[PDB]
Amino acid sequence: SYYHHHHHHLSDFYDPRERDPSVSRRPQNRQSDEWIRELLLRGTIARVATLWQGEDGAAFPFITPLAYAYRPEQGDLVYHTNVVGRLRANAGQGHPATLEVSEIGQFLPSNSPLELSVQYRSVMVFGTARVLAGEDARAALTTLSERVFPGLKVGETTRPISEDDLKRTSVYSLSIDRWSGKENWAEQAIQEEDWPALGPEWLG
Amino acid sequence: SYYHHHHHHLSDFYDPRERDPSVSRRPQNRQSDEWIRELLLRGTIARVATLWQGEDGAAFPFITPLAYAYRPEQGDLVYHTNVVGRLRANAGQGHPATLEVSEIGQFLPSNSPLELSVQYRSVMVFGTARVLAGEDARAALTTLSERVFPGLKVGETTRPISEDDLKRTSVYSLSIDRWSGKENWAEQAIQEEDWPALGPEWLG
Numbered sequence: 276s277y278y279h280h281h282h283h284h285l286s287d288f289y290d291p292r293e294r295d296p297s298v299s300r301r302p303q304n305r306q307s308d309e310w311i312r313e314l315l316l317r318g319t320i321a322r323v324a325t326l327w328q329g330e331d332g333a334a335f336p337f338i339t340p341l342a343y344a345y346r347p348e349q350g351d352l353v354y355h356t357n358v359v360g361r362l363r364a365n366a367g368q369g370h371p372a373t374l375e376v377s378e379i380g381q382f383l384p385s386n387s388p389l390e391l392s393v394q395y396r397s398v399m400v401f402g403t404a405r406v407l408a409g410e411d412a413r414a415a416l417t418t419l420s421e422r423v424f425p426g427l428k429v430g431e432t433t434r435p436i437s438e439d440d441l442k443r444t445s446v447y448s449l450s451i452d453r454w455s456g457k458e459n460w461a462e463q464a465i466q467e468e469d470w471p472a473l474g475p476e477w478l479g
Numbered sequence: 480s481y482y483h484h485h486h487h488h489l490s491d492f493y494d495p496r497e498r499d500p501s502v503s504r505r506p507q508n509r510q511s512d513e514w515i516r517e518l519l520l521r522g523t524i525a526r527v528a529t530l531w532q533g534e535d536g537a538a539f540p541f542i543t544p545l546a547y548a549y550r551p552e553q554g555d556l557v558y559h560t561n562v563v564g565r566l567r568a569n570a571g572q573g574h575p576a577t578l579e580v581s582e583i584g585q586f587l588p589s590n591s592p593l594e595l596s597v598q599y600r601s602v603m604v605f606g607t608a609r610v611l612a613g614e615d616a617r618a619a620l621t622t623l624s625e626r627v628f629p630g631l632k633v634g635e636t637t638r639p640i641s642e643d644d645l646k647r648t649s650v651y652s653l654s655i656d657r658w659s660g661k662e663n664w665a666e667q668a669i670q671e672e673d674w675p676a677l678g679p680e681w682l683g
């Protein structure tokens with residue numbers, strides 16, 4: 276900055292910058308519903324958090340990484356998991372569930388300590404998960420499998436999904452209520468001009 | 480299998496297999512506390528789930544991916560995040576938190592549909608997170624930064640962490656109560672011998 280330069284020789288914020296008019300004007304890095312849909316469609320791993328009763332009787336969350344598929348027409352995401360707790364902290368046949376899908380890029384170095392960061396694209400989904408049965412379960416497991424293994428066809432590449440398979444597997448539809456989408460994918464973190472610049476080890 | 484071979488020409492479970500005596504005998508793919516510690520030490524991204532009050536008054540979980548560091552002597556993990564809800568579904572100055580760290584490898588194809596899987600190593604941590612202040616916060620942010628950017632030194636590579644930095648940042652210590660560790664990192668999924676084997680596109 277001038278003040279520092281001049282001090283050596285003896286704000287930023289409101290001053291000119293380039294802006295691409297095509298960029299999102301939404302606060303807090305937020306993204307469009309179309310962007311969220313496309314991120315969900317290309318992802319294959321998610322974390323799901325649901326609530327279980329703990330030892331003190333209080334609800335607490337599990338976090339389970341698992342394969343998933345977004346089914347846009349049905350308005351859900353499907354996954355299977357045999358991970359359970361004792362009792363769900365939940366009244367009813369479905370349970371509230373949060374699901375997260377992200378694309379995490381590179382860590383971004385800076386000579387400014389609070390500008391250290393990582394590239395990310397991230398979706399949070401809020402809804403109700405329910406266990407599927409029978410041909411509902413078989414269809415969801417098929418969509419899932421054929422999604423995460425492109426080119427695989429259940430019944431051809433693999434034997435068909437049998438009744439025994441289904442008895443041994445808990446398959447869920449997370450029916451979507453709300454979602455959120457956030458991206459910060461800069462190529463370089465904000466740097467501090469008035470401190471020695473990072474060397475080529477860092478940015479090269 | 481014989482039965483199928485013979486049927487064409489016209490159990491597995493209890494029969495001989497190789498076992499490495501060095502392998503974990505724990506059920507459900509579980510791992511030692513030493514293994515959990517080492518996984519936590521090499522990781523740099525975690526998800527944290529904490530509970531917020533929702534619209535119907537019920538608690539529900541957020542899932543936040545963030546940079547983290549395990550501090551074994553202190554018995555905690557530290558991270559910063561400005562993500563908040565309305566009110567935490569929580570009595571007190573700390574809040575219950577679950578933290579997840581995983582290494583996710585390749586998706587593993589099979590001609591058996593319920594053997595489709597993905598390689599993973601995964602830790603679940605259960606504890607109480609509390610906001611840090613002052614030199615506690617500065618030290619934790621330094622450990623974090625110098626962990627996720629090896630070779631970076633706060634105060635040298637970057638300007639020091641200032642009081643303004645600290646006012647703008649919520650830095651947490653998740654004090655560990657319990658943890659869990661799980662691994663399934665096979666090189667190949669279990670296949671079904673009595674269905675056409677996968678072609679070289681899949682396993683080659």
Ligand SMILES: Cc1ncc([N+](=O)[O-])n1CCO
Binds near residue numbers: 339597661
């Ligand atoms: C710990 C874990 N990481 C990935 C998975 N997975 O894909 O089933 N798992 C299994 C349990 O959710």
Ligand SMILES: Cc1ncc([N+](=O)[O-])n1CCO
Binds near residue numbers: 377394544560
């Ligand atoms: C959505 C997201 N993905 C990664 C991050 N991050 O590293 O801060 N974030 C930011 C908020 O947690």
